[PDB]
Amino acid sequence: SRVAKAPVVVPAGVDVKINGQVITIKGKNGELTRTLNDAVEVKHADNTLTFGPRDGYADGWAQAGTARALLNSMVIGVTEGFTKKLQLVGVGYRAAVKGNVINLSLGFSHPVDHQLPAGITAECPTQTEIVLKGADKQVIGQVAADLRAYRRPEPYKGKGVRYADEVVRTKEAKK
RNA sequence: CACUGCCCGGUAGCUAAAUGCGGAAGAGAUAAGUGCUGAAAGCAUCUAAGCACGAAACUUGCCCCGAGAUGAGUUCUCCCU
Ligand SMILES: [Mg+2]
Ligand SMILES: [Mg+2]
Ligand SMILES: [Mg+2]
Ligand SMILES: [Mg+2]
Ligand SMILES: [Mg+2]
Ligand SMILES: [Mg+2]
Ligand SMILES: [Mg+2]
Ligand SMILES: [Mg+2]
Numbered sequence: 156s157r158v159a160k161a162p163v164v165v166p167a168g169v170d171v172k173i174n175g176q177v178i179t180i181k182g183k184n185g186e187l188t189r190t191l192n193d194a195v196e197v198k199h200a201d202n203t204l205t206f207g208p209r210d211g212y213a214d215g216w217a218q219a220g221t222a223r224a225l226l227n228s229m230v231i232g233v234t235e236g237f238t239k240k241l242q243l244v245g246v247g248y249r250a251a252v253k254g255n256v257i258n259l260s261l262g263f264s265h266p267v268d269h270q271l272p273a274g275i276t277a278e279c280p281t282q283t284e285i286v287l288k289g290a291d292k293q294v295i296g297q298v299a300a301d302l303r304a305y306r307r308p309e310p311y312k313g314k315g316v317r318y319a320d321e322v323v324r325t326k327e328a329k330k
Numbered sequence: 331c332a333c334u335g336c337c338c339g340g341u342a343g344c345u346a347a348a349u350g351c352g353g354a355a356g357a358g359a360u361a362a363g364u365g366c367u368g369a370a371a372g373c374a375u376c377u378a379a380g381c382a383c384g385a386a387a388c389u390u391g392c393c394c395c396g397a398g399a400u401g402a403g404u405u406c407u408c409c410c411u
Contacts (some may be wrong), residue, residue, distance in 0.1 A: 216370070291365095296366045297366050
């Protein structure tokens with residue numbers, strides 16, 4: 156609707172190939188591919204991407220409204236990248252990356268090892284910090300959630316793997 | 331012959347009180363639940379398109395029966411010239 160009217164201007168240095176509903180986008184950071192819904196039209200006059208409804212579908216401007224913001228993120232990923240910072244709060248909590256494997260120490264009797272997917276590369280500058288980078292926005296959101304899901308941040312001291320941006324609302328251990 | 335007359339021991343077999351083993355791990359698709367991206371609805375949103383996770387239940391895996399499975403299947407050999 157009000158999202159699907161506004162065009163996705165695709166900058167130079169970015170290759171865009173339309174194949175029916177399949178849309179590949181190649182750039183210097185990577186290449187990405189998504190099939191659209193059957194309710195969406197897509198076309199291109201050399202600078203802009205426009206997303207129209209195919210006539211006859213009731214969910215026209217919502218399926219075409221989703222398709223704009225998906226491809227608006229595919230362009231940013233192949234030319235800038237999406238980066239997600241994660242920290243650690245607590246005593247003895249520390250991280251370490253070996254190649255593509257985060258090794259966590261989070262208060263358990265066993266070690267914690269994570270296996271980073273095929274487009275995501277991780278970096279611990281600090282033992283209490285993870286910085287991970289990737290082209291696809293949906294995968295850096297999913298990788299960040301699986302690391303936070305080992306010690307979901309405590310409601311008493313904020314303790315555990317949290318996101319960098321968020322506020323963790325704390326509670327007093329009351330009586 | 332007297333309850334095997336009354337008793338004392340005891341081979342084999344059968345047995346428990348004797349002594350071996352078992353319930354699983356793993357796989358799949360989920361429940362309640364938890365999320366990721368994301369519009370309708372410029373924001374927000376687990377959901378409408380798409381992606382992940384999740385239980386002694388479910389489907390397997392473990393044991394036995396099983397082609398009268400009339401939908402009566404397969405392989406190997408033998409006999410009758
Ligand atoms: Mg007599
Ligand atoms: Mg005896
Ligand atoms: Mg199992
Ligand atoms: Mg599952
Ligand atoms: Mg949104
Ligand atoms: Mg959200
Ligand atoms: Mg049990
Ligand atoms: Mg039942």
